Symmetry: D2
Subunit: 144 residues, 4 copies
Amino acid sequence: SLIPKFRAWDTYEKEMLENVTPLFDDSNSMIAIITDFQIKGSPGTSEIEIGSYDTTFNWDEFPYVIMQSTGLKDKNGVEIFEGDILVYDAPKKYAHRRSMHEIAYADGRFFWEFLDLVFCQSNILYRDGYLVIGNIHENPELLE
Amino acid sequence: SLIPKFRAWDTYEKEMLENVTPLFDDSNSMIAIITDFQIKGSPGTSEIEIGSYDTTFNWDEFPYVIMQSTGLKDKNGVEIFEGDILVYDAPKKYAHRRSMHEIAYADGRFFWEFLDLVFCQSNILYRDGYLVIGNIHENPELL
Amino acid sequence: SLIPKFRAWDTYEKEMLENVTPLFDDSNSMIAIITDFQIKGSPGTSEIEIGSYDTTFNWDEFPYVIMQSTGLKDKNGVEIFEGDILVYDAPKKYAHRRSMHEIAYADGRFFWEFLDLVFCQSNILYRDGYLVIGNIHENPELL
Amino acid sequence: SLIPKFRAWDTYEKEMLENVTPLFDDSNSMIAIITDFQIKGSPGTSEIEIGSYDTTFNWDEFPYVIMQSTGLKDKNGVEIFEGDILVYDAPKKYAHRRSMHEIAYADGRFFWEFLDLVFCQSNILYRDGYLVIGNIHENPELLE
């Protein structure tokens, strides 16, 4: 099963927004985003009260980039999203260079890039395990 | 890189709703659904006008079951979702069980059940190809 | 990155032979098997001394079925081969059978049948882990 | 199923040997290689006659690197082995090199390195398809 959960990088404000709801037209294009809402009212006469939101008509270039949760967690229990960048949590002693690996989606599955292992919960936790160190938007220096 | 697209089975109305937007609390529980909306503003400024929707306030148990698109298509160009049931498009073997393969997501990937080939667009189309024949909600006693 | 290792089911003796070397002719059909050999040279002129072997000419039906090692081990350190049958080793909660999963190779990977998980070392060992309980030849009626 | 088929790179002579039979002890060390054999003698009384061969006796380090067939074919029907390098057979354009990926085995599967696609027969052949254009031993600068 996979519970749909999304975060958005606001490229104009340079801010990561958690728990957002992307809204699409019937043609697979994002047209709005709800960043906060609450449900109000009584049983049978309830409503969705949108607190904060934005739409593509407000912008020449809509500044939100959406990323979905993989439903997997890292060694410290942090939920892994598309765009996260992970590293093997090696001991400090005899420290040796390690590469970082970005999470992406293709061909029906989430992949970590440049790694021989299959991306799955057991591989994330195996031996010393993997940790999310940042993401491609906030931390592009991790892949330099 | 997967464009999010969802459908919902409404267990109360016994119907499939297309192009829905599920709304979750910050704790993994679905608390509302938007089934139609428009953007309007002339300028309003622009606003989201919810057309049809439901919330968990309205129910003892929220009757909507959400399914996400894999973004892959079957041999007939049908978009494949979680809960779809696929079969290989071969001749029909009369009076014997036909193998059926439910689509689900787990542990980082979508997969089809009971099949040695890996679920991916090229394998869906290879040879005679696979077709969606229905899903586990609209067609409950097939599997 | 995969050490070639083979075992053979002897369908005449009904025994499993370990560390065998299958030999294939130019038609890619198995023609012989080496079950024991030594290297006895002296010292810049070495030789392969085959000590135990068999060939398709010594039989009407060559009674050997070859299975290759996956290179992976089960939770008890047992090397896993094609044709093995694995179970998840959760405690016996009184009176229910563990589901069984045969190992095969196809289309680029070794895999376990009827399972949502990727067949890889970490999944084999995760939590209670998986154990080999038999194989399709020694235990033809297990599945 | 997979018919075991092996090739070996002789790293002393710098030659690829086709269709070899690798011989291992029980500790997983290759100690011999049969490059040619035939079966001889009376039915019921037959023998393996070893033609070309080599053993680890003659060597400080046995100079042969074994690679197994994946069982999969490229767009030209060529059997793909570990160590092969594949390219996507898109129309070639001036001064643009097509991207290359090495075949490896790890942890239960064969795969193409640095490519987020399931390595399977239908993906090898899909759309423009992939072709074997060398291997890491005979063409050690090819990946660059």
